[PDB]
Amino acid sequence: PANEVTLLDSRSVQGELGWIASPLEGGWEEVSIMDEKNTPIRTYQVCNVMEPSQNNWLRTDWITREGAQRVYIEIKFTLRDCNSLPGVMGTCKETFNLYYYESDNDKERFIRENQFVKIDTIAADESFTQVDIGDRIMKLNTEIRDVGPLSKKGFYLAFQDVGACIALVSVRVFYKKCPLTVRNLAQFPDTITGADTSSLVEVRGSCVNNSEEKDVPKMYCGADGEWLVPIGNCLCNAGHEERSGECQACKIGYYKALSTDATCAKCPPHSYSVWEGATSCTCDRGFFRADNDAASMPCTRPPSAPLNLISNVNETSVNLEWSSPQNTGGRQDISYNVVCKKCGAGDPSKCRPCGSGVHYTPQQNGLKTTKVSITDLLAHTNYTFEIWAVNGVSKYNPNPDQSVSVTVTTNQAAPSSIALVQAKEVTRYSVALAWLEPDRPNGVILEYEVKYYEKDQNERSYRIVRTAARNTDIKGLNPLTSYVFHVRARTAAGYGDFSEPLEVTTNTVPSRII
Template identity: 55%
Template sequence: TDDQSRMNICWKNLVSGSSLAVCRPGFFKASPQSPSCSKCPPHSYTHEEASTSCLCEEHYFRRESDPPTMACTRPPSAPRNAISNVNETSVFLEWIPPADTGGRKDVSYYIACKKCGSPSGLCEACGSHVRYLPQQIGLKNTSVMMVDLLAHTNYTFEIEAVNGVSDQSPAARQYVAVNVTTNQAAPSPISIVKKGKIAKNSISLSWQEPDRPNGIILEYEIKYFEKDQETSYTIIKSKKTKITVNGLKPASTYIFQIRARTAAGYGGFSRRFEFETSPVSVAASSDQSQIPIIAVSVTVGVILLAVVIGFLLSGSCCNHDCGWASSLRAVAYPSLIWSVRCGYSKAKQDPEEEKMHFHNGHIKLPGLRTYIDPHTYEDPNQAVHEFAKEIEASCITIERVIGAGEFGEVCSGRLKLPGKREFPVAIKTLKVGYTEKQRRDFLGEASIMGQFDHPNIIHLEGVVTKSKPVMIVTEYMENGSLDTFLKKNDGQFTVIQLVGMLRGIASGMKYLSDMGYVHRDLAARNILINSNLVCKVSDFGLSRVLEDDPEAAYTTRGGKIPIRWTAPEAIAFRKFTSASDVWSYGIVMWEVVSYGERPYWEMTNQDVIKAVEEGYRLPNPMDCPAALYQLMLDCWQKDRNSRPKFDEIVSMLDKLIRNPSSLKTLVNASSRVSNLLVEHSPLGSGAYRSVGEWLEAIKMGRYTEIFMENGYSSMDAVAQVTLEDLRRLGVTLVGHQKKIMSSLQEMKVQLVNGMVPL
């Protein structure tokens, strides 16, 4: 019948799930046109029949743009293992993606920046002046750099992972927090310069302090020159935020730029400000025709007089402070620049200003003061009191001995200066029964250290000389010497963190180089590291004799030098320069990347000298980025003029930090052997009679059986072992891998240089 037929059709439609079917609980049909019912996707449900969509379970959500067939998702968990690298007022953050992405692929990151340590004790938002590279919101990669932060400020960075449903969740934010303290930095550029009174020969200027002074402004530097005459310019220094510049030409346009200086150095110059002097005013005299004649006569007379006096004084006043002579020159030639013999003239505009003239780059811009050797002082006490502050012994509390120095014990303690908070310090003491020479040498280091002020140079707090024991007080570095710290934390840091350490050391060395100071003993043992992983150059003692240093086994001028860290020309010809410091820096790079491995292993000093002279260079450390190893090789150029300068090294490392992907390319494992080493050279069996004897000698005897079972039964076979082979054999500990590979490398080096009878 017709009714029976209709019932059969309805039944078939129900069975087939056609558009006429009613979906049971747990199923849904998004539209009547859908051919069948669909099961609710993960983390969703229906409790009613004929549902057109499924509801999300608790704590799960769906975006409006998500199709109904898509599973309900939730916000991601917090990112993991966030680390920071502080570089003056910039911070680099890196982290691992969250363990739970919430079931979505659209995960991005948001960085919240908070400045802490305000008088209220609360943290506040950083503000719009902070820049995020590449961005703060919607970050896809797992690293970011914040720049233009304030100096000496505590920050908290919260890294939050978000996805398409994060804004729907009422739950608390899931983030990982990183606390950092920025270092000292130069001030930001001055942005506003205003002109004041303008006359025919002078212009008055005023300006505002930089938006970010990053410390106490010590002085300002005003650079000016006549328009289109940039090669001849004048520098004026002032401690005020206003100045009147005299000695200008009438009706002339001048360009002015100003920068500020703090203890961290000079900031950048402001943009160029253009101001014009007034025209020549006409004298209200009835006989104006005589003015030019009188002016010319006076000028000629003064010039002739100045020339005669100049010849008389040129020989003596170039090397002495003949203030009256330079003043006379300034009167005679107010618009000219003296660069013959003397180079520049100083003309005091007022007690707080210093003026220098420069022409065609003949005079070096005085961005940093020059280092003064304290040994040139007749009285060493005068040097130490000129460069170091005297501290009352009652202000110091010695807590414990942390080491031994050349002249006595090294202690940790506390320093409480009047009106200031107590803070931790390191204290070097001069041992009892010292000679006058020992006292002079001991305080000589303080006289050197006291001239430096840089975030990557150990800071001198002061000295105690008026009571016993005589002490040198410096800032306290919680993690001690860099070589020991790296050995204790073998394999625990990312490449970016290691590069950050190297960048800090290079920055400190650039500062020393700019001041004209040659360290001569740059090594990881003489780098100190604090709790924020900031590295600081220390130990300025190689200007003294290093008789007791075990690393110093080559005598020069009555003292000893550390062979493994010293450039070949410094060993052979005593040519110590910033270029020889660069060589030493390359060795420090190798120490850092190899986590404190001893350079050249157990080779003797004479063998090191011979090998380096013949062209041998340390092989790249295990898992070393190719870019870092290439920089090491550049530092080890035989021709010292071919080595990079420290400012170039800082620039190179900054580029690597800004582009972390450039550090992912490792040196090819097959090129780990030096260029002098013939690949696949058989080791023979002269050094060790068996594989077991070799492994026992390097305290890796536990692996003897594994080596033998896998066919490495002779030293010739062991010679071909690679890092991948060790992993395959089950040598998984990084420290054990490094020890075995370093031992093999050492034996190969000795074979090439004929140092052991293999």
């Protein structure tokens, strides 16, 4: 019934035990008790109290050790007290000796009586053990005796009677063993107990096929037939979670990048579901993950180019400025790459690249700031720059379809100021504005910026209204508030100057009666 492997048993034996007894008549009797469906239970009996100098031997059959170390012998017997019935002074006994002999030969006819070695004298105990074979309760005292270490192939066990009323009910022969158990996600095989009580057995078992050894696993198989302290845990491999037995793989829609104790996590947002036992959730079409970026982070989109581009020119240098991108994609690392083209010079589309050493003081390629300044550019020659937005993923991702660019001139000056501005309509809610283009353009006019600032009060933040058309209307203004309007012409070639300061007071509904 126990985890310990048995060698010899009274019930488990095939038919007869095959035990050699000396003498045959008047010695050990085959008094067996039958209490099973057509199957008997073997028991040896001897009771020669009246006869003097009684000596009865009972040797067991050949026992195959099968790689044993320490053998435990459990004997269940009935011992009749010498007080129960009157007898002869110093004749009756209440003890029986236990003998053992090691041999190599399998089948033997006779074993030498004097050659046997005694283990210990077995006697009765006060506490009776309750163990029954049939329906009625039987109270027989049990005794356990250990012997070891054994070097030979097998051994023989002998029972000696010195004139006592005894019956050997159950004879169990078994060795203690450490069972096959899986602890700390590592397999441990069946190991036999040590030869000494003060000696421990070092057991090192191999880990699961779908798991990697992080720490060396070891267990100590004690003399009792069980492990003591577990040292070293085997962590589950990437794409496999913790389970009762072996490391179970991650289900459809789960991933595990590194060997961690935590279970399989669900796919991050905007990521395609992979098959059972995946390392990392792959990104679907339109989304791509960076090499330097962690597996825990979700899939990101490619960046967008900044729509607005402001350019100011000097005699030999050019200054560029742009706003933040529209679609970020989902990454904090946004850089800008400036590309020289020299396509501005000449009417045809095809041109030669900037082979010469163009110097730009802030950064060469991949600037984090939204402002850049290009120097040492040749005068009288037309140029064009392509400010291409670069993300952390954009390298792995395909080259972005479009990049916002602006064509500029070197030697040509900045635009002049507007000669005069005029108000067309004057009402309590809106004031219309009209203006002409400046006297000297010095380039193609692209935008007109208008500034508004309140008078008689503290300086409020300037109102910005961008209109390419030569006419604009003000909106949402309080009555009786005088306002100064300033227009500024803006080109790709440069920055314009402030216009005529027009002081117009907001119209009011009449109140004076004549």
